[PDB]
Amino acid sequence: MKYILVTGGVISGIGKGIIASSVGTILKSCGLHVTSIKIDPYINIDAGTFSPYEHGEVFVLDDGGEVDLDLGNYERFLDIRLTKDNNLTTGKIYQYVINKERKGDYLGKTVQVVPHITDAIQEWVMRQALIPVDEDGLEPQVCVIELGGTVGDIESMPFIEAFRQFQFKVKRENFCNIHVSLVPQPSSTGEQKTKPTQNSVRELRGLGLSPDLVVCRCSNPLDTSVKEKISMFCHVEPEQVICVHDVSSIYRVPLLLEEQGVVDYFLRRLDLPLMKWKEMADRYDRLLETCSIALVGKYDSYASVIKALEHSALAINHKLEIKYIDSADLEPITSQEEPVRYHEAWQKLCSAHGVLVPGGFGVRGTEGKIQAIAWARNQKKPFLGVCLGMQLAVVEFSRNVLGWQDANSTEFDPTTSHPVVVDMPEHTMRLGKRRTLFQTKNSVMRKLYGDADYLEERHRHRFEVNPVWKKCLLKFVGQDVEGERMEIVELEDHPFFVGVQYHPEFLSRPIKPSPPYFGLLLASVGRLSHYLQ
Amino acid sequence: MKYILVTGGVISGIGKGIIASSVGTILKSCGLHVTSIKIDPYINIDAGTFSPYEHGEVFVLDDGGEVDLDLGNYERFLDIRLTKDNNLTTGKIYQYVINKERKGDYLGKTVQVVPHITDAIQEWVMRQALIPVDEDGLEPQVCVIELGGTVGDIESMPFIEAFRQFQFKVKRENFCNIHVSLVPQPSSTGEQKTKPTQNSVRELRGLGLSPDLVVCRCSNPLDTSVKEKISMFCHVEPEQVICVHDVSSIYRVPLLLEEQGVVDYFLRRLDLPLMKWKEMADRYDRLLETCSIALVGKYDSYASVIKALEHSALAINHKLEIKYIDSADLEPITSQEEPVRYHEAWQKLCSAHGVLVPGGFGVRGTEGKIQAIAWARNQKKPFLGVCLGMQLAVVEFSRNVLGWQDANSTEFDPTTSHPVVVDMPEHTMRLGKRRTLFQTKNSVMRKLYGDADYLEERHRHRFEVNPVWKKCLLKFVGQDVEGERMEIVELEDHPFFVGVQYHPEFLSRPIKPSPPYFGLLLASVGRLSHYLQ
Amino acid sequence: MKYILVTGGVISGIGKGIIASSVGTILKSCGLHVTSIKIDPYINIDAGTFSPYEHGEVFVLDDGGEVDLDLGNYERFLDIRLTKDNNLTTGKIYQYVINKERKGDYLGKTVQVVPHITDAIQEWVMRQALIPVDEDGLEPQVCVIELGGTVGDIESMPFIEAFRQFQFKVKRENFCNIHVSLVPQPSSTGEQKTKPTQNSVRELRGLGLSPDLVVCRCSNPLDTSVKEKISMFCHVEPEQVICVHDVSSIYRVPLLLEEQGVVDYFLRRLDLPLMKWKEMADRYDRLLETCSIALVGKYDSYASVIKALEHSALAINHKLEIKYIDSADLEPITSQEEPVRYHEAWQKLCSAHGVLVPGGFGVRGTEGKIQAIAWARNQKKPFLGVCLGMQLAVVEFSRNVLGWQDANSTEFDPTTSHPVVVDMPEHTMRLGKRRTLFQTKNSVMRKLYGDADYLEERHRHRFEVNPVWKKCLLKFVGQDVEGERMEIVELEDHPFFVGVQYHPEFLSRPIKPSPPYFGLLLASVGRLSHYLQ
Ligand SMILES: CC(C)(C(=O)Nc1ccc(-c2cncc(C(F)(F)F)n2)cn1)c1csc(NS(=O)(=O)C2CC2)n1
Ligand SMILES: CC(C)(C(=O)Nc1ccc(-c2cncc(C(F)(F)F)n2)cn1)c1csc(NS(=O)(=O)C2CC2)n1
Ligand SMILES: CC(C)(C(=O)Nc1ccc(-c2cncc(C(F)(F)F)n2)cn1)c1csc(NS(=O)(=O)C2CC2)n1
Ligand SMILES: O=c1ccn([C@@H]2O[C@H](COP(=O)(O)OP(=O)(O)OP(=O)(O)O)[C@@H](O)[C@H]2O)c(=O)[nH]1
Ligand SMILES: O=c1ccn([C@@H]2O[C@H](COP(=O)(O)OP(=O)(O)OP(=O)(O)O)[C@@H](O)[C@H]2O)c(=O)[nH]1
Ligand SMILES: O=c1ccn([C@@H]2O[C@H](COP(=O)(O)OP(=O)(O)OP(=O)(O)O)[C@@H](O)[C@H]2O)c(=O)[nH]1
Ligand SMILES: NC(=O)CC[C@H](N)C(=O)O
Ligand SMILES: NC(=O)CC[C@H](N)C(=O)O
Ligand SMILES: NC(=O)CC[C@H](N)C(=O)O
Ligand SMILES: [Mg+2]
Ligand SMILES: [Mg+2]
Ligand SMILES: [Mg+2]
Secondary structure, eight states: OEEEEEEEOSOSOSSHHHHHHHHHHHHHHTTOOEEEEEEEOSSOSSSTTOOTTSSOSOEEOTTOOEEOHHHHHHHHHSSBOOOGGGEEEHHHHHHHHHHHHHTTTTTTOOOOIIIIIHHHHHHHHHHHHSSOOBSSOOOOSEEEEEEOSOTTOTTTHHHHHHHHHHHHHSOGGGEEEEEEEEOOOOTTTOSOOOHHHHHHHHHHHHTTOOOSEEEEEOSSOOOHHHHHHHHHHTTSOGGGEEEEOOOSSGGGHHHHHHHTTHHHHHHHHTTOOOHHHHHHHHHHTTOOSEEEEEEEEOOOTTHHHHHHHHHHHHHHTOEEEEEEEEGGGSSHHHHHHOHHHHHHHHHHHHHOSEEEEOOOOSSTTHHHHHHHHHHHHHTTOOEEEETHHHHHHHHHHHHHTSOOTTOEETTTOTTOSOEEEEEOOOOOOEEEEEEEEEOOSOOHHHHHTTTOSEEEEEEEESEEEOTTGGGTOOEEEEEETTSSSEEEEEOTTSSSEEEESSOGGGGOBTTBOOHHHHHHHHHTTTOHHHHOO | OEEEEEEEOSOSOSSHHHHHHHHHHHHHHTTOOEEEEEEEOSSOSSSTTOOTTSSOSOEEOTTOOEEOHHHHHHHHHSSBOOOGGGEEEHHHHHHHHHHHHHTTTTTTOOOOIIIIIHHHHHHHHHHHHSSOOBSSOOOOSEEEEEEOSOTTOTTTHHHHHHHHHHHHHSOGGGEEEEEEEEOOOOTTTOSOOOHHHHHHHHHHHHTTOOOSEEEEEOSSOOOHHHHHHHHHHTTSOGGGEEEEOOOSSGGGHHHHHHHTTHHHHHHHHTTOOOHHHHHHHHHHTTOOSEEEEEEEEOOOTTHHHHHHHHHHHHHHTOEEEEEEEEGGGSSHHHHHHOHHHHHHHHHHHHHOSEEEEOOOOSSTTHHHHHHHHHHHHHTTOOEEEETHHHHHHHHHHHHHTSOOTTOEETTTOTTOSOEEEEEOOOOOOEEEEEEEEEOOSOOHHHHHTTTOSEEEEEEEESEEEOTTGGGTOOEEEEEETTSSSEEEEEOTTSSSEEEESSOGGGGOBTTBOOHHHHHHHHHTTTOHHHHOO | OEEEEEEEOSOSOSSHHHHHHHHHHHHHHTTOOEEEEEEEOSSOSSSTTOOTTSSOSOEEOTTOOEEOHHHHHHHHHSSBOOOGGGEEEHHHHHHHHHHHHHTTTTTTOOOOIIIIIHHHHHHHHHHHHSSOOBSSOOOOSEEEEEEOSOTTOTTTHHHHHHHHHHHHHSOGGGEEEEEEEEOOOOTTTOSOOOHHHHHHHHHHHHTTOOOSEEEEEOSSOOOHHHHHHHHHHTTSOGGGEEEEOOOSSGGGHHHHHHHTTHHHHHHHHTTOOOHHHHHHHHHHTTOOSEEEEEEEEOOOTTHHHHHHHHHHHHHHTOEEEEEEEEGGGSSHHHHHHOHHHHHHHHHHHHHOSEEEEOOOOSSTTHHHHHHHHHHHHHTTOOEEEETHHHHHHHHHHHHHTSOOTTOEETTTOTTOSOEEEEEOOOOOOEEEEEEEEEOOSOOHHHHHTTTOSEEEEEEEESEEEOTTGGGTOOEEEEEETTSSSEEEEEOTTSSSEEEESSOGGGGOBTTBOOHHHHHHHHHTTTOHHHHOO
């Protein structure tokens, strides 16, 4: 079992998780079984507590683990499905050591960061690397470990100290370190300034790790002079200095790393035994005709959602132009306070070829979602409602077709006489992979799902369609195995108007877009009726 | 005597010397006498040894000190003239302590960095601050000390350790620290990333200095959220967090700092007792008509030269478009190897309204300077030759008017039968402020110099017009006090064709452009004959 | 050429130079040619400027280099004779780079600590290691480099950074690092506290060197538990953790290191191709009868002097008890101010079996030296005067035999009518190895020097016997080659009363004591008249 530690230098956000995922897909293209671990240096046990503006888009695993979006990048670059504990955190590891101490497992010895926390990190990394997360049950050959944050943060110090030991616990042929840095090119200077990379490598070596690769996040490509200054002051070979510059599509980043020789490096360095990504890149860069989706949302918070639309767009062979609409601008109160916000949002929503109402929590902007769904019903615009979008598609059909004008969920208005979507916990949240049964053949969604009698999809919600009001409601084509819970709704006498109670986007891959996002893209270009035919 | 230490964070080149100079001109606008010290953490005693690609444009002081371009920024933002030792270096300070040790002045004690080098830095800073560098002999009230490099470099550590002591030697009301940092805004992220500023302030506090001001070099203005994150993690008041964003003209940087409240801060913080810069900025931003100068040079290396043209441009009320021409592209051999380089250079040189041949050293590109001067003579283009440009204007007039086709300097071709410019050392280099006498009234240069019988200008050259060949040569209107050395040449029967043996640009200020650069700008827009009239 | 860097941890003074010398004599016992370099992180060029209380006993090399006492430990543990530049300092290396910069050798580039000073250190270390300092002209196989100071001092950082590069310039088989630390055992705690060693190794690894050996300066031997805690937290093998505890004699320190396995370690670790020290130790520890020497001195400052007496003592097979007498206590003014100091000093001087007046500078205590020599003449006590002791033996014979009661040197009393020892510079100081000729056979000193017609000895003085007054003066048996300078004086009609103008102690080795120190030891036990017979 080989390990690659990806570490971040000057700043976060510089594509380190894309580099980690690209290194993984490169090694998978070498025929290796590859797993991945994200370390997030935060005290939070799971991302499920986060407001989607900080560590945006909590990605939901099969087991119900609410984790960082980087775990979703791993599942998209590599055909793996991960477990909760592939997201390591200081909360998870300190709680482990604390509970272990309270049980007496440390045998009356003083517990402390070195060794006991640094051992716990190594134990965890070894354990999770041996788990066959891959699409078939084969034991992984390499684990790409991404350390979040930046080096020399007080939060990252335990993990770097653990990896400093780890490279002597496993042999050097089993441990590589990549340092992903920034080389800024200021307006103030015109030069590509390597100084912060040099200081960050110096800092990392002060913590006892020496970069085997220095991967520079550049905007423009590195000059030779700057690369030789990096090689010099980072005390490493020129071949081991890489530029990841700005590129047109995500699909080029493995190819850029391939060109830069990292594959050949890893093969020799770790003693180890992608033409689709050329194709997808070249295909992307020659898309002329454009679809347009209105994303009517509250909240990067739509990372998986956007990616699922781009997969779908590339599959139908169109560009995508996503009309990001703040749902709080489609509310009639924004017509009072800011008529410029109100009319620009409705220009965007009307010019859109279809509309997507994504999931979320809280009242704020829900009435703007309900008005965006009303537009999409009555003007026959292709509609996808995801999680909350299904719940509010049942509220909108209740208000403006059934005439139950009071109707809402018990999340927002528990005082309502028509609680058409109700708090319905698992006898907790309906969270992770559940099986949905198709209750019929009469579904376009069933046809898009390949005419299977069931599907299994990742859920993350507390509320469901009320089974009393269901009798008056809007064909609930997908149900749970108990028949208790409605999980797909499809409206009769519309081109495509779907609510799904799960999150389709978490299972979208470039090679296989999720069928409701594909159906939305197909319908909003009029190709769905050809596809189903 | 008050001290302000300006320190650099993430990178160099982020306008720290402009910030230091702006802080100085702000305090001078408060009516204070202000001096400045640049510390360059390099082992070099003086910049006179540098190739102009590294620490480009060696600025020459009155005393003959060859120093960094930042000393020239101090002389341009503040009407001061500095001494050699206002450029402090590790070479100057270690050589001081070493020579002092060899003389036994440390009384048989072991000399070491702390205290003896850190004392020497403090001694130097106090001594040079008491020197009246200002336009009248009044003792300075504040010294702006700029520390070059970045904090936590092994070179900068002695100086930061010295300043850590200094703030307890002089009282806190006599010592302020400004930290000039970078807040990058990546294409990869869209966010303004404060992390490297936080780490740099943390690093600086590890070296025992706490930022009184954190000045963020931004591209775009700081968001409130980012400023509050800086104030938090740098543990300082929001009012003490400043953004210096990108602005149109240099003239706005004091005004931006003024708006950001730093003047009011310094006045209270140091217990101390610019409308022209509004004017110059607004004047600059509304210039419509453009002059164009061909800068036919070898080598930022033309920093003072460019600034002198921009002063002149703003004074005549035109824009400037500088046609940077690599002199090595005007050589006929570049017509052989790269005819695209050769013709683009001659398009630039012919479309130019006048030509400037700046100073320099070595053969490389001199034949391209000689061909650019030949163009400027015979096509009656306004010409300024500076230092080497005068020497080569005497070579060109010798080759193509006198027919001495062999002619060159003894620097390039010592074997020549017509050594028309010869190695003529000071009985060393002719370096620093010398007095030139005007040998006549018949000079446009004398009229531009206000009809004075002499001028005093900063020289930096080893070679001079041969007094033998002078008799055959091209009116040498300016001579030294000995009559040994020709120091201005002016050609008869041309609009404006001047060689000066000194560097006029080192004495250019926004409020007073140097007369040959002004005369070139005036002549290349046809206004000179009105100005002299 | 192999390198061993010895580095110091918690404090200086913890026997690091004895460890370095012991490692050298171990490798020399393996049949290797071994050289040594001391790095002193101080700004001083040479130790010749020091007051003997700081870096006490300036050791004088053949070339006239005045260096630290550790260079003398190298010459005593290994039969080598060193050059000036085997003492490296920051003064020597910064002056090198500065002078090299002023000559333009750095080609207009910015000189800075990394690379240019760190390169200069590596250049120096390589150059001085190739010099055959050994007793025959064979090129060294290993250089033991001792870094003075402690790790993580701002002074030591350039050298550790140089060695961090050096281990990748030469291969790992050519570079070993030993870390000599302290393990304190407080009265407050009873435990041996490894924490400062762990922190010092952590600090050293932050500077990029990892201990190949951790040598603990212990008082008492390490416990197993403490050694295993060191091995753990210093992340190194138990076999690579060594205790150098307190031992009876210096002769045991190589044997202790041998027992601890370091020889076997170095042989494998550096891929390389002492029974006298058992003997000398066992011989020392069974010495019963004692000689006693009065050391009547001003000033560790007598390190070489003490060692030369101990060599002599071990050779005659007696113990030595050195009566350290502050010469300022034998002055009659101390009878006025402190009669307890005055009488204790004269009890010590009278109970002594012989007296040694060592070299020194300045008036202070010279009248106490003159009174100690007066005692030794007239009471027929065996006397050795070294350098200043010869000069003052000519002053004392002038005052109290010739009756020139005014007599002194021109150093102390230039106004004197009998300047019997005069300032006589080299047409500078008479410094380093000079040849002395014996002007006769009638000398006990010539017999002790093996009946050679000349000797060559290390001098360090500015003053000499006046050749005018010489005619009235006390047989000057040793002269320089010019006959200008008297260099041995021997008094007729006394058991043994010798002045030497050189320093015999710098050439004393355990296997060969210097003959005047041996003659003093022999005479003060009455064995000299048997030895010469
Ligand atoms: C949104 C879109 C269209 C895309 O091309 N985005 C894009 C483009 C360029 C970069 C980029 C540019 N330079 C440097 C770096 C880095 F490497 F340094 F970070 N990145 C990042 N993201 C897309 C479709 S599918 C997807 N992502 S995905 O579903 O995970 C799939 C891969 C498995 N994104
Ligand atoms: C060349 C030109 C026309 C100029 O406007 N340049 C320019 C413009 C903007 C900035 C700038 C933008 N944002 C931020 C910062 C910083 F503060 F963060 F660095 N700077 C820097 N330089 C000029 C004329 S005169 C001169 N300079 S000068 O002769 O010394 C005189 C002042 C005394 N330059
Ligand atoms: C003065 C005397 C009698 C002596 O035994 N001293 C003594 C004794 C023990 C230690 C000692 C105890 N524990 C630990 C460590 C260390 F290793 F950790 F430092 N040292 C140090 N010095 C002596 C004679 S000859 C000489 N020295 S010498 O001429 O250079 C010759 C060797 C070539 N000294
Ligand atoms: O203002 C000054 C004065 C002196 N120096 C000194 O000159 C050296 C120049 O070094 P830089 O700071 O330019 O760093 P670099 O070349 O290693 O990296 P980038 O430019 O690519 O970011 C520094 O390390 C410092 O010792 C300055 O950088 N700037
Ligand atoms: O990938 C991950 C995982 C975890 N974390 C953790 O979350 C914290 C988020 O902090 P950031 O790294 O975003 O830093 P910041 O907000 O102080 O500064 P800028 O964004 O303006 O540059 C970090 O300090 C680290 O502890 C990440 O940053 N990224
Ligand atoms: O007062 C306290 C409280 C807590 N601790 C904690 O317990 C740990 C005990 O560790 P020590 O400080 O005893 O260090 P050590 O055993 O590594 O080394 P020596 O004793 O040989 O010097 C420390 O590292 C700290 O985390 C104390 O040491 N002391
Ligand atoms: N995942 C979501 O979109 C949440 C929807 C809704 N708030 C619920 O809890 O069911
Ligand atoms: N300052 C310059 O332009 C130098 C010109 C020429 N090389 C000289 O030494 O005179
Ligand atoms: N080495 C010494 O003892 C110095 C003796 C005397 N001061 C001289 O200079 O000669
Ligand atoms: Mg640089
Ligand atoms: Mg952040
Ligand atoms: Mg302990």
